[PDB]
Amino acid sequence: APCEVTVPAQNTGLGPEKTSFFQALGITTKISRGTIEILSDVQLIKTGDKVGASEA
Amino acid sequence: QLIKNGKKITAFVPRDGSLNYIEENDEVLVAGFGRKGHAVGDIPGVRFKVVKVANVSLLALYKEKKERPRS
Amino acid sequence: DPTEVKLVYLRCVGGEVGATSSLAPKIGPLGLSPKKIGDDIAKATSDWKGLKITVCLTIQNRQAAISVVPSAASLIIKALKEPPRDRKKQKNIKHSGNIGFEDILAIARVMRPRSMARELKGTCKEVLGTAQSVGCTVDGKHPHDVIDELNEGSIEVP
Amino acid sequence: FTVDEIRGLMDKKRNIRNMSVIAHVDHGKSTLTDSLVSKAGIIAGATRFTDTRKDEQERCITIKSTAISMYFEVEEKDLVFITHPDQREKECKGFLINLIDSPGHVDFSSEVTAALRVTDGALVVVDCVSGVCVQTETVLRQAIAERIKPILFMNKMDRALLELQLDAEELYQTFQRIVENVNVIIATYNDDGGPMGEVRVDPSKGSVGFGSGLHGWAFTLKQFSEMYSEKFKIDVVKLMNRLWGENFFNAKTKKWQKQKEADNKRSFCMYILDPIYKVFDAIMNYKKEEIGTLLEKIGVTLKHEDKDKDGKALLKTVMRTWLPAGEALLQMIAIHLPSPVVAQKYRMEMLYEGPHDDEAAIAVKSCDPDGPLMMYISKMVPTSDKGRFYAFGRVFAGKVATGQKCRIMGPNYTPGKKEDLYEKAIQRTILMMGRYVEAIEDVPSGNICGLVGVDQFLVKTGTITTFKDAHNMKVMKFSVSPVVRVAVEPKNPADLPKLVEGLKRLAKSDPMVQCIIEESGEHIIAGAGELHLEICLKDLEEDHACIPLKKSDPVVSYRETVSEESDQMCLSKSPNKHNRLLMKALPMPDGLPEDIDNGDVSAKDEFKARARYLSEKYDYDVTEARKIWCFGPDGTGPNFILDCTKSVQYLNEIKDSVVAGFQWASKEGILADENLRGVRFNIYDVTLHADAIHRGGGQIIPTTRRCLYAAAITAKPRLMEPVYLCEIQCPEVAVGGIYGVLNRRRGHVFEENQVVGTPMFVVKAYLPVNESFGFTADLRSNTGGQAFPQCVFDHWQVLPGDPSEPSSKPYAIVQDTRKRKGLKEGLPDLSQYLDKL
């Protein structure tokens, strides 16, 4: 990771899909009327930390 | 085929159109032709009448006064 | 907050247009524009010249859908053919290959919207000409090295 | 608590909740409902009637339909929390909760939907390890359509803790994924969320509870916040959000923490799951010392001659004495739960086919028991009084008279329609408790009621209304098609009356229960599921028919066609041999038979007027079109007499005997007997025996049969097989598996269209009937079972199949049908049929 990867709390705005995939590495995500939303600005990944294939 | 005896009878369907009202595997009332047995008139071996299909009567159904219970 | 709405959206494939509960879904109803109407408008430009797998840019301006067929040079050649069995026997097969079109292909080369890393017409003539599987150039001519000797349209459009 | 008490609590409508359990098999529908029943203590109370139809219990097997009511009282402080509707104050502490009878039964269940459709509430069981589970989604999609507010319990927590060894933090991510994976279904199908307001089952509303259903075993978030509220001086309302686990517990600073930073001890671990883990660890390791201290800190009361035995036995008693499985379930039911008073207001559009502005519709909103009786049936269910069929019903509009004269409206009841409306009195109105009957004088809206003898005029789908202007009953959507069909015939041929009587009994008993007679004298019994059909098949054998039953196929329904030009010059002779008829057979240009069936091609149709349609559009020679004789079989049929003979003087006499032989021949197909597919037969030349004494119908009816038979064989004879439209519903990744199956079955796709297109696919496809068993299994193996099929009866399509050649694709069918009919095992040939001029 060259930089602190951050995810912005807003709709993505995706189908009734894989909420589980985000929540697996615990991006805290909910659905807010049927569009998948990110529930809070979180740093997934911190400088020099190896990006998992699932998170990539 | 009567319920008491399993005996096979041929019975006539008196008043109009009537086989259309009979429908195979329906419960039918068998009554006789008022002849002390003896086959009708010019009708071979039909000692009997039908008076009802599905408990309503044939008679009511032709005039149209009544309508057949579903099944 | 939408202000002015100049929005660009891409959709492929025009047989006639469709209309049978099909189409975008997704893009066309929260773009306010319609569902049913947008392909009826799309017929006009994919109607007479070109029924054969479009590539259509729909551009939304408030509730207006502008079906431009992105100067879809492929369709232009295919439609330049010996042409208009519409349907109910296109069915042999849409690859009907024996059509001359010298300077109507030239207009198709202009339409390819300036972009071609060109030098205009000299270069652009070669690129669409070679792209022919269907047309095989000019009536009595094959195609490949005929192209290099194109003494025609060069100055006219620059 | 007697009968009189129950009646008082019915009037009670704001404190009623009519509900269902929604779950996967084997995810503990049975265990939670047993846990509820044990703890019911007023009106149940000893592990009651979860799995009532034997082998239901033995298999554990939630087949199927009955029976629970619960009473529990409400916490004075807890009453205040209770949200819903027009300042009641959801009045007086006691709440009746009526739990109905969910089939686990992933089939999308006409029985499942029947329970659901009334269905003010739902309890959703999803298991922690196997989380969402298509099986929950399927029942939930239907529930959420029917406006179905769910409340989730994540079950089998102990499997995670004991077996898996379950990572405290790891268990939170599984909780988060799974709850939100329920919100996949809820969020999209809320019909509109926001006027359905955020149905939103998450965890800080603590509408989600945590799962020891085997160990009963109940996880309240509300329960936790109430214990900790007086300890941290903290705000019960505040604490719900703060135990909602970006809830950072920084003990050092005392810090309420939105803070995952510095290494961040989640609230749902720290204070909640950590004491729970400690009870499990300290007990299952026989640490008699540590057990003592843990029990005392949280106050663990040691309960009777049960002190005996160490770890697992101690685990059940201790977890039960802490944590109220019934109580946790019940709190969530009481507090957020579906009001019928609240509930019916929203649901109105769904329920009423008529008038939303109608007087009856307005009464259902308000739950006015002074209203026109509005009854949704529901089912007729399961009585060991198999001498009839006791109706499961709900009151939504006016009370429930013993014996009110009630107009019994069968499902397609339009009120200007005299059609099957039966006005008869209801003998008894009944509490269904669930294998027992209690007789009650009055049914208030919004209560669950049993009706007797609605049975005979209740084959299925009912609405009962004193309302002449009322307003049937949107039942229909029970479908997810009953296409899994087997023909049932008795081993006993004397047994036949008991069978037929039993078909009426099944059809009352089961609203998935479709019983129809095939054309090839077979009684078809049809289930949503292969498994639901197995269940029905057992019920007929054991109970309703008491029969001795043979279960075969479906044997299917053959039709016979003619492809080309009659080579021959086909000539018959009478048994008096003077009688000769000369005949050709033709096709059948393919749009035209379809037109006759449609029925654009009217056989009562004035021949000259309808000749024009046959001639101009159809390519009909104009004269032949006028000259149709006969449509045959039964003469509305797609097969023709064309009278190419116009001056065989004789003709006028002979026309009736020709028409008769045509009808016979057409039913009577020479190949397989074997009706009559799109053949035109053209009458040649006819040569007269002078005497019309010896133009018998006895002579001529055979000439026409023989010659038609001769014409059809030169005729290059062919068969037909039927093919069906299949609407198969997929969350997009699943579409691939549909196609894989169709390939095996040789068919044909249709079209593919998507609703709001992250929105489920509907894939439309051609499947031939004989290959289409086991559809539900094969689709589901590939999908991996997202695969939900629906299938018609679309189509009769022609095979290029020549039966005269025992090439054996068409003629195999032919040979089998002939042999049953007894019915000379081949013979097809023109030697029999032709008298050489």
Automatic annotation (TrEMBL), chain C:
<dbReference type="InterPro" id="IPR020784">
    <property type="entry name" value="Ribosomal_uL11_N"/>
</dbReference>
<dbReference type="GO" id="GO:0022626">
    <property type="term" value="C:cytosolic ribosome"/>
</dbReference>
<dbReference type="InterPro" id="IPR036796">
    <property type="entry name" value="Ribosomal_uL11_N_sf"/>
</dbReference>
<feature type="domain" description="Large ribosomal subunit protein uL11 N-terminal">
    <location>
        <begin position="8"/>
        <end position="64"/>
    </location>
</feature>
<dbReference type="InterPro" id="IPR000911">
    <property type="entry name" value="Ribosomal_uL11"/>
</dbReference>
<dbReference type="GO" id="GO:0022625">
    <property type="term" value="C:cytosolic large ribosomal subunit"/>
</dbReference>
<dbReference type="GO" id="GO:0002181">
    <property type="term" value="P:cytoplasmic translation"/>
</dbReference>
<dbReference type="Pfam" id="PF03946">
    <property type="entry name" value="Ribosomal_L11_N"/>
</dbReference>
<feature type="domain" description="Large ribosomal subunit protein uL11 C-terminal">
    <location>
        <begin position="69"/>
        <end position="138"/>
    </location>
</feature>
<keyword id="KW-0687">Ribonucleoprotein</keyword>
<dbReference type="Pfam" id="PF00298">
    <property type="entry name" value="Ribosomal_L11"/>
</dbReference>
<dbReference type="GO" id="GO:0003735">
    <property type="term" value="F:structural constituent of ribosome"/>
</dbReference>
<dbReference type="InterPro" id="IPR020783">
    <property type="entry name" value="Ribosomal_uL11_C"/>
</dbReference>
<dbReference type="InterPro" id="IPR020785">
    <property type="entry name" value="Ribosomal_uL11_CS"/>
</dbReference>
<dbReference type="GO" id="GO:0006412">
    <property type="term" value="P:translation"/>
</dbReference>
<comment type="similarity">
    <text>Belongs to the universal ribosomal protein uL11 family.</text>
</comment>
<dbReference type="InterPro" id="IPR036769">
    <property type="entry name" value="Ribosomal_uL11_C_sf"/>
</dbReference>
<protein>
    <recommendedName>
        <fullName>Large ribosomal subunit protein uL11</fullName>
    </recommendedName>
</protein>
<dbReference type="GO" id="GO:0070180">
    <property type="term" value="F:large ribosomal subunit rRNA binding"/>
</dbReference>
<keyword id="KW-0689">Ribosomal protein</keyword>
